[PDB]
Amino acid sequence: YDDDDDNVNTEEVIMNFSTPKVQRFLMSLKVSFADKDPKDICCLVFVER
RNA sequence: GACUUGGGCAAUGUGACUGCUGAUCAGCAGUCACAUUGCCCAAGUCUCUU
């Protein structure tokens, strides 16, 4: 209820309802693919389960 | 003991694709008969001609 912009709400909860692992993961995403060519980027995410 | 991956054996189905039969419909072709009025040649009968 501090902010009502659903974009800002989603970003805030993704930033603060999440472990530092996911925070750093998404930060690597944003610093890697901020505004690059969508055709240029082609990446894999490997997880356990 | 969780976690992950892969494979195999099952059954219960679905989605379609062709093959055959029948029916329906659209789509083309080859004809044939035959009234009507015309045209050009062949041979006939007759007026006239003679």
UniProtKB/Swiss-Prot annotation:
Cellular compartments annotated: Nucleus; Cytoplasm; Cytoplasm, Cytoplasmic ribonucleoprotein granule
Effects seen without this gene: Abolishes RNA-induced silencing complex (RISC) assembly and RNAi silencing activity. Abolishes siRNA unwinding prior to loading onto the RNA-induced silencing complex (RISC). Decreased levels of endo-siRNAs. Increased susceptibility to infection with RNA viruses such as Flock House virus, Drosophila C virus or Sindbis virus. No effect on the processing of pre-miRNAs. RNAi-mediated knockdown inhibits the induction of the antifungal peptide Drs in response to M.luteus challenge. Also highly susceptible to infection with A.fumigatus, with 80% of flies dying six days after infection.
Tissue expression: In ovary (at protein level).
Record note on domains: When in complex with loqs isoform PD (loqs-PD), undergoes significant conformational changes during the full ATP-dependent dicing reaction cycle for processing a 50 bp dsRNA with a 3' two-nucleotide overhang and a 5' monophosphate terminus. At the initial dsRNA binding stage, the helicase and DUF283 domains transition from an extended to a closed conformation, this anchors the bound dsRNA through major and minor groove recognition and forms the ATP- and 5'-phosphate binding pockets required for dicing activity. The N-terminal helicase domain, containing the Helicase ATP-binding, Helicase C-terminal and Helicase insertion domains, functions in dsRNA stimulated ATPase activity and RNA translocation during the dicing reaction. Essential for processing endogenous and viral dsRNAs. Binds and hydrolyzes ATP enabling the dicer to translocate along the long dsRNA substrates, and produce siRNAs processively from the end. Some reports suggest the domain is essential for the recognition and initial binding of both blunt (BLT) and 3' overhanging (3'ovr) termini dsRNA substrates.
Family listed: Belongs to the helicase family. Dicer subfamily.
Physiological role: Double-stranded RNA (dsRNA) endoribonuclease which cleaves endogenous (endo), exogenous (exo), and viral dsRNAs to produce short interfering RNAs (siRNAs). The generated siRNAs then mediate gene silencing, also called RNA interference (RNAi), by controlling the elimination of endogenous transcripts from mobile and repetitive DNA elements of the genome as well as exogenous RNA of viral origin. Also acts in an RNAi-independent manner to activate translation through cytoplasmic polyadenylation.
Protein name, entry field: Endoribonuclease Dcr-2
Source species: Drosophila melanogaster
